[model samples]
Target: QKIHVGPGELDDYYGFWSGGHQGEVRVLGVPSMRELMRIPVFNVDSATGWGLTNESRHIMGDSAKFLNGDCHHPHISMTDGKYDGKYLFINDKANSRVARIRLDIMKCDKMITVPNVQAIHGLRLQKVPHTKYVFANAEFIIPHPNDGKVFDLQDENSYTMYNAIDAETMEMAFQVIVDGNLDNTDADYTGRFAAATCYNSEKAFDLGGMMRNERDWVVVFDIHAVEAAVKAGDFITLGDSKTPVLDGRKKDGKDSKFTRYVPVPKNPHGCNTSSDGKYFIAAGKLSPTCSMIAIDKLPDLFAGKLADPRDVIVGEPELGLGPLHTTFDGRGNAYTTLFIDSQVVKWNMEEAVRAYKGEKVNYIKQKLDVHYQPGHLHASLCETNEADGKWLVALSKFSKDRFLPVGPLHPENDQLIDISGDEMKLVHDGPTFAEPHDCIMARRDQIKTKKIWDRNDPFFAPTVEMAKKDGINLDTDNKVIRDGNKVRVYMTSMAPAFGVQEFTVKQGDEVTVTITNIDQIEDVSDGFVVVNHGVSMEISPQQTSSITFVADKPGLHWYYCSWFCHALHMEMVGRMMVEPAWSHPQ
Candidate 1:
């Protein structure tokens, strides 16, 4: 039975996770474990008018920028490195872009591309509460910058760039050129800093699997300090193109506040900070002992005081094998996800640090196991601007026999765990999507968010920012216009009930289908997908998304909402009659 969720009742802490292949960010309520909403992040979800609306297309930016990305990381907006719960950010790896989602209305607000980069894996805050910036981390890249056609591992110029984004506008602010084939990065306690685990240190390139090495680093950066360097002209003028870049390596000898890179042993996945902001933790994915790094040690680490900035690292006690990611509680505890053994290791923050400083303390308090291969795990504000100190959601990579059979492509097992006690306890799982990568959680009462977007308000367009700024005219009704070879169809989308629009044209006519989600109900969203052609788009309530293609088939083709289970969901259909190219006149 559904819980009678009434007013003044604190909504169950929400969990936002990446729906990998779905190219959408899923919203789920914990405790009750109910699937609430599916906010389209990367893909074209016509129900909410993402790409179908002219305004949204502009938000999707360049046509090449529209991505069906590997939805991996979901970083929440922070107040002081703790979960503030106002905004949530996620990335699409397959398409290489990051999205900004406003938590209040539960809508995907902005999707900004990492300019001239290959892949975007994870993101974090530059500072908390004030929330000035967000950084998109690049994992791997081709030998040459901005080009991924070569496999030159020896090229020093080859680097995985970090794209900086403005929190307000969700635009690319700048790029941090760190010299490494970096991977994932997590935020620190105050959102003022970041700790990221990166591998492929010997300048590796992605062609096939020709390398096996963990001689990498768990790097840390002061996101606020980097912005100060930005004020100090730390930008490197690389070429005639005048594209801006920040060389993180230049801080090695000079007096800079921007960055600090430490050479920790191989295979650290989760870069995290203690809930108290005392230190940052590195989950050694390939190593046995995870790293509990203190910021006080980073000075010598950055000034080249280490014996091996390449491999010289010292941290706390050993735990399990394949430590992938770590989270914190509201108190003084740390929880890490084990990939190989599929478990979680919980220990105290003070004990780990004290033991590293030479003391007798019981660091490993609780060890719990899960369904299958566990990667990055998130607790409700565990390591954010505000620590929830309660519930945890463990995102497993393989769901082998966990749920009902849904074909060979099994759903990722997202296990909800209760951590209010000494030992961890399993909760519920469902609402888990494929390739479920990184997830974030927040307390419902703690989040102070904006109002839900009303359809009557200025139409919000990603590219157009509501279209007027971009000077694009929009018709929010059913109509058709023909000009020469191009035919434009303007349509409105309402959830569940399919509205049919008929069009008759020649075989080779260029067609643009512009649709807006007119539905005002918060939960009911409508989308469009063409079964006959290679076209699909994501749409949200009050959003306008569009698609254009050449109608070459000489037959009746159909279009319908991709959203599942709206009353008469299938009734939201449309058909187009295309005449044979040779038989019809222009």
Candidate 2:
């Protein structure tokens, strides 16, 4: 049984847009073009275009300009309640404020403002389970250096941190300038600014000032201590300062000093812990692969470092491309998104542990599978059944401009994939995707009842006799408008209930079928037809469509649609049967 779901117009981005720029979600049963249901997002305005946040809620950058008449990128977060809720937060980069939106009710509930904070890049909510306070990270900005020397002006950039405001009272709690830097632009002392400075170059000839040359670092703060220090007006010192380990420091002519900043293997952009919190996976956007740091003990630093940091490479070397994000399943499996190649890499974390212990861990050959053409990929795993099978959903954010040299109409436009079990295969494939950046496993269920017709059942018989009793005929008296050994269907719809016909041809020979839809009001008709094996094209009202294709392989095919005009136009589904030149008797 096949369910056909659409005569609806296709989205310009090659997906399905319900109304306005907001899109609709459509799910179909395999082999049947049945349109189950459509879910639409309301309250979406032209200004609030499409950009899904990490939490899977749509984010519209702040529309209202702040004091300086500049708008900022909108942020989104998870809501405080149930029903798979989400919250939208906006980073007022120009005005230095964070706007929180409750998507469930489609309303903005709170806004927190920080003075002198600008160009906030990444704003996330970090809080313990039982804690009342949330902290955020803000990347500030400084004037681009105009010094004639390219390598010497790298220290002019600035970055800072801010404390989250209470959602209920809307009061800024703890405000602190984490770090900053300044450089001289004019000769006079009055022209100089005493901007915040944390790091100093070792020498005048050192190339340490370059943007890429700066060491990557993470400053973890004690939430409770930081909040307490903020109340007392004291500079909060986070966990003992640690320095990143890198061998290139000697090349810059500087005596390497451990700054208490733990060194990550590369430019880490995304990080997440396992469901059980046994391991922490950090992905580097500039590095081709990600490193998995074992978190065996809580509140332990150097002792917890893996004996061999190279143990971070678990399954494969995701080389020459940026590894964007890494997530863990409830079963201790790790999945990562490669931004440069537009692919997803899955790893067995349990195996990684064995390898770390210096045992003969059976390593799987690294497979470079293309999940999608390079774009942005965000993934999450959800349990599909109590039996422990989990489904991994990845949403790809791809744009025409991102595919350089390749035009928009190319086959590799935005796409979605559902990965599950051992051998990850494409269970669904189509053009119903565009810039689908992030996806979360919302929910899943199984079919409770079984249908009567089973194609594989040996006793099953064609219902053609029932159609004939209902006054349907299968005669070939109409004039043949086209003839071919192989024909591909461009499109077809339906007329009124009428005769059904079947044309038989050789296994290697091509054939063509022409259908005309003559019904008014787009009424349900039985003339709607399709070739089972290949692509089916749509035939509009009062239009004649023809399809030609060679029967390269022997198989049964069907073409029938009882009626095609009841909203989901029914009665236009059928089947065709084919046989090889030789076959064993059953």
Candidate 3:
């Protein structure tokens, strides 16, 4: 009953969950495990008018041609290694794109697709100073052109890239050519180095070929060096994109100036930084040990002062089978999810290091069995500097008989555990849809959301600019402007009444309707939907929204508010009288 929040009570944490193949982000109340809302990104949404609105369509640009998205990791922006609550970044692995959601309004405002990359799997942001850069790992190795002109499986030119996007601008800043297939990535608290786990060092096309190497490596990048190299004009441009690309791949068995490869066990997956900012643990997918690389020794390795990059390995703690991901608590302990063993192993970090040094000490503290086949385990506020260690969630891939049988498709179980005590206690089991690759949680007080939209918000600034160009005001105007075959209908929606009750245009004419909700009260949002034209949009309080469509039918079409606002909401309707195209005066 501790997980249950009463009718009027609220949750303490806000959980930002990845929507996996659904191409969206889900907001849930932590501890209660109740879903609050869904923010659509790479997918089309009918309820929120996300992909249907002109404003959202403009942000997507040419990439809107593809409708499917595979969202992997959802990370909140941080400053000084703390959650700043300014923005949240997520990656679409299916389309090689990244999106930024403004925390103030909890809406996706910016999105950009990476050039010359295939699947963007791993995503992380800079922790120190601010989230200036968002690191994205391209998963697949493809030809340089990727234009079907060259198809060689064993070609040396086959490679992937490590991309960095400006978090504020949502634009690609630079790219680094990596040697193998990058799996997952994380950045240290210092903001100087970022590390990624490379699983396919063999550069093979088959699974057996990829596992041929006994030891794969974690690629550590010198971020400052890469920035300096780009500033010095020591980079190349790929394809038609002007984004600067640098070569960080090893040549002739030599480390590059920007990257150092540290050999670890085979097929390493998750790379996570401890909350204490000391070490980065690389989870071994096939092996049973997790490699603890010292974060302080990275500078010496980058400066060529160390004989071998492996000197940074301070500890290699042998845990359970298939250690996929590791999370931390502020109490110097780590919780790693063992996939094959279907359990979460809790061990002391300092004791693990001592045991690695041939000391007679046991590092294992406790192990808790999950439902089945857990992949990523995360503790409350573990990614931030303020790890409370109050709660932990284990994302189990196979729920099996945990819930009622729902036909051939079984829901994935997201089991919640209380980590505040020495023994982890299973609190709740949430049946999730499709899949959720990963998630991150922040305190409710940290995230500050607005009740209403600002009139001057830049989200719809382009439409306002266009209105200004046409000598019309969106807030107070109810008029129509005709330009050749293009018609711009501007109106205001306040509660249960629309400023423009009726408008007329010729059939086959392009019509763009812009509506501004002038209601000052919170939650008094209005919606506009045209009958039989497949057009709709949302106009929130003090917000402006627009949509475009063709008046193909010559008849009286009715428009109504799709969202309920007041008692007279049913009476809020308008008519669009489209005349026949042949009746036009030439």
Candidate 4:
């Protein structure tokens, strides 16, 4: 006979928590972080997925891609552009093509075949709106020359580039190969010019080790000149060395000449440009440090002028290992997602300066750090109001237990080991996340400062904006009642349409509640919609509503507005608590 254990009592149980069980709250310093809600999406083959935004109030997830196949590196074009709201382009690495999905209605619209480009890694949208120029790095296949495999830098036919195509016309325009033969093209970004990283396959055994070779490069291309060069026979010309390309190799000693190659930090991958178009930041794949390059002077350095490139390093001391992707917030601050450390590092561009006299000015500052772990991360700013506050969203790839690295390492080898049950079982345990990858902050008012307004004040609060810009208002006018043992909540809103409010309550409590919709114009949807634990209920409008219940578990709980008329369904979210009354454990 099987014995069914009650909630919070199965310490030895190793399976996943039952559905509706809200996992543990992650503790960050003195404050306890709680899971307000788990947005459910259908996982394809059981792997976790990424998030994307299309300039809409609702943020979308790609669970289908994760579960269906080995879908990695999902990207979205959220703003109005060539693709516009019609599609979300994702790198279907498993199929070796760019998969386009209809965002307004979630479905795979079309897949564009990238000939000779296999094992495609990163996908970046051009800054120029409506241009069919989407850049990606492809690893060439050796065994089956036509099939994608490892990139061969010795062969001109074994490279990839800025794949210029007309999205609307669905026609392949042209491919501008990186002038020199380099094993791999990891990441690229376009602004005043396009910047990319290429490494020697022969130097490093693995992708991560490529950074130590010092032969890797950060290549800058003048967009117009590159196109023109492609049309002319001298397509691959070294502006710095003043030499023309021959036989897919540079005229100068490619390895020794500074102009042919610029040293990159170890295993550099994701590269991004600053908002003002002054600097470019590249993530160091194996090392903890990220490299910054000044746009104006980099061309000269590529020509063998600068002695040490270290003069442009940003956030040198603070960033830890596996700094994967770097993105700018438009304001001097840059943010990076650290893969190995499981944390996000924010850099302030205004703090960066030229340590060398003749060096170009660098503008990236490493500011704030937030921890989450063992998962691949992608971050962007979500503006809720006009103040321009920054909110960093993280995607966790491993389950909570795996992230913490539990159990013994190498039981047979006697080495320290980090083990979790099976991948699926680990995903079922409390707080288990299945391959949560990219993070995008959407909706306005989600990251705003809490406001304290006077009862007699007659000004209107601003509406919440999209995550791409500065966020909206955060209301802190409600009062929390803590009476010796029980807690009560009271909230008043100027906009009645924003009717839902969430809160956490102890298992036991008889509480009084008062709510008033002061806005004379906006009609209330359902005066009160309160959700506790997993159950939801509605309260009467224009009146005080109260309910009492016993506080049971010693864990975190959640409550949110259940009304549908509001602008955003998730925006009306809030938290609750149910805990033991004891002071300290004996």
Candidate 3 runs further than 4 Å off: none
* TM-score for each of the candidates: 0.80, 0.47, 0.98, 0.48
Q: Higher TM-score: candidate 1 or 3?
A: 3
Worst 10 residues of 2 by lDDT: 184-193
lDDT (Cα, tens digit) per residue for candidate 1, span 1-586: 1233455554567777787767888877666666777887677764555565455565577843554667887777766554666788887777678888877766676777666667788676654554677767887755545355665756667666777788878766777777665677756445556667677665644523313564467667766677777788767744343446777654445533456666665656677766766676777666776777776556566556765543223355677888888888868888888888899888887777678767877889988988888887888776554676677888888888888888877778878888877888886765476677877776677566443345444334442243343243543556676778888776766666543367777888898776666666665555677776876766566656677788988889988778664767667777888878888664
Candidate 3 lDDT by residue in tens digits, 332-364: 999999999889999998898888789968888
Candidate numbers sorted by TM-score from highest down: 3, 1, 4, 2
Query: Which candidate wins on TM-score?
Result: 3
Task: Rank the models by lDDT, top first.
Answer: 3, 1, 4, 2
Residues 1-586, candidate 2: write the lDDT tens digits: 1123356632111111111112223333322213343322222222211111101121223423222312222222222211123443434444455555444333344555543344443343321231133334344433223233443322532233444555435455554433322110001011110011112222222334323434342322334444445455554332232111111122232321211133343445554444444444556555565545444421343233444323433433333366766554555556666776676666676775566567666433233355454433322322111212233434344443435445544333333444445655444333333233333333222212122212222111122232234342222223222234443222233333323344445466565444444444432332333444443433334433334456666776766553344554444454444556565233
lDDT per model, in order? 0.69, 0.37, 0.91, 0.39
Candidate whose lDDT is highest: 3
Q: For candidate 4, lDDT tens digit of each residue in 1-586?
A: 1123354432211111111111111111000112222222211210111111111102222222332222334444433212234434444344345554443323343445555445554555555433345555544333214344645544545544434444544344444444432222222223225566565434334556544464455655454554545457543432232122322234454532212334566646656655455566767766676677776665555455666654334333236767776655545556666777655566555554432333445433332323344333322331111112332334444343333555542101000111111110111112333232332332222222112223222111111121112221123336555564455455554433333254555445544333334333323433333344323333222322233344555566555555443566456554555545463242
Give model 2's clash tally.
57
> After superposition, which runs of candidate 4 have C-alpha atoms over 4 Å from their true positions?
1-69, 78-86, 140-162, 179-192, 199-212, 230-261, 298-318, 354-389, 402-436, 441-586
